[PDB]
């Protein structure tokens, strides 16, 4: 079964906002995969206090977010297609030391995958950057710089003996740190076109005014648009090599 074929007729869905955010899915469509990112801001300095990251369950008409923990905004992304996928499992590993690395369960292979890094506390709150994981490999390494807090590697693992040609895919992730005082574009290698991805902005002070979205499919780049404690623009996507 060609995962390209079904990732083009799948339907990305993104949602940003404070509590409550559960991004939902179209008629009889189901969450193949996805993830949720929560930001938590001190009740006084209003600076950042922490990141959190969770998985959307397989076969659900909603990203069930799953809180009694305060959290002040959540960026949510789900790929939502017709059916749940067989032999496919999602993963988050988090770390604090230099390395952060993840193996795939039942010896699977990365289909989708990326690391985010942060540095919520020194005093440079959004050190938050982004890295790609390679389709095909069983791992995903990611060394973090120092005075980083935590690294969040999230990957969708497929059983590489039924999902074919993962070696034909590639993950792109560009980011750029905008100041606190003008655009961001990233394009596929090997003249590739997008399968699925997301584009957004994050802050270390957030007033609640919204900014987040999804990449367009069978196209060749992904684009954002800028809307101390400064804030970052990012783009993650996955490409097939044509």
Author numbering: 559 to 625, 628 to 681, 683 to 742, 751 to 777, 779 to 797, 804 to 818
Provide the authors' own sentences about this structure as they appear in the paper.
PPLPs are found across apicomplexan species, and contain a conserved central membrane attack complex/perforin (MACPF) domain, as well as a unique C-terminal domain, named the Apicomplexan PLP C-terminal β-pleated sheet (APCβ) domain, and a variable N-terminal domain. The MACPF superfamily represents an ancient homologous group of pore forming proteins, which function principally in cellular attack or defense. PPLP1 is implicated in cell traversal by sporozoites across the mammalian dermis and into the liver to invade hepatocytes and replicate within a parasitophorous vacuole (PV), as well as in the evasion of host phagocytic immune cells. PPLP1 also plays a role in erythrocyte egress by the merozoite stage (gametocyte) of the *Plasmodium* life cycle, via membrane disruption.
The structure of PvPLP1 APCβ domain was determined by X-ray crystallography at 3.15 Å resolution, to reveal as expected three β-stranded repeat motifs arranged in a prism ([Fig fig1]; see [Table tbl1] for data collection and refinement statistics). Each repeat consists of an inner four-stranded β-sheet and an outer two-stranded β-sheet, locked together by two disulfide bonds. Comparison with TgPLP1 APCβ domain (root mean standard deviation, RMSD = 0.978Å between 170 atom pairs) reflects a conserved C-terminal domain architecture across the *Toxoplasma* and *Plasmodium* APCβ domains. Flexible loops between the inner and outer beta-sheets in the third repeat, which are absent in the crystal structure, were subsequently modelled in for molecular dynamics (MD) studies (see [Sec s4] below). Three 100 ns atomistic MD simulations of the PvPLP1 APCβ domain structure indicated that the overall structural core was stable, at an average RMSD of 2.5 Å, while the modelled loops were more flexible. Comparison of loops of APCβ in PvPLP1and TgPLP1 reveals that PvPLP1 lacks an extended loop and any aromatic residues at that point in the structure, containing instead several polar and aliphatic hydrophobic residues, as well as a histidine residue at its end rather than a tryptophan. PvPLP1 did not bind to any mammalian membrane lipid species tested while PvPLP2 recognized anionic lipid species, with a strong preference for phosphatidylinositol 4-phosphate (PI(4)P), followed by palmitoyloleoylphosphatidylserine (PS) and Cardiolipin, and a weak association with the other phosphatidylinositol phosphates (PIPs) ([Fig fig2]). Sets of 20 simulations for each protein were performed. Only two binding events were observed in PvPLP1 simulations ([Fig fig3] and Fig S6). Similar binding energies of −15 and −19 kJ mol^−1^ were obtained for PvPLP2 and TgPLP1 respectively, while the absence of an energy well for PvPLP1 indicates it has no affinity for the PC:PE:PS (45:45:10) bilayer ([Fig fig3]).
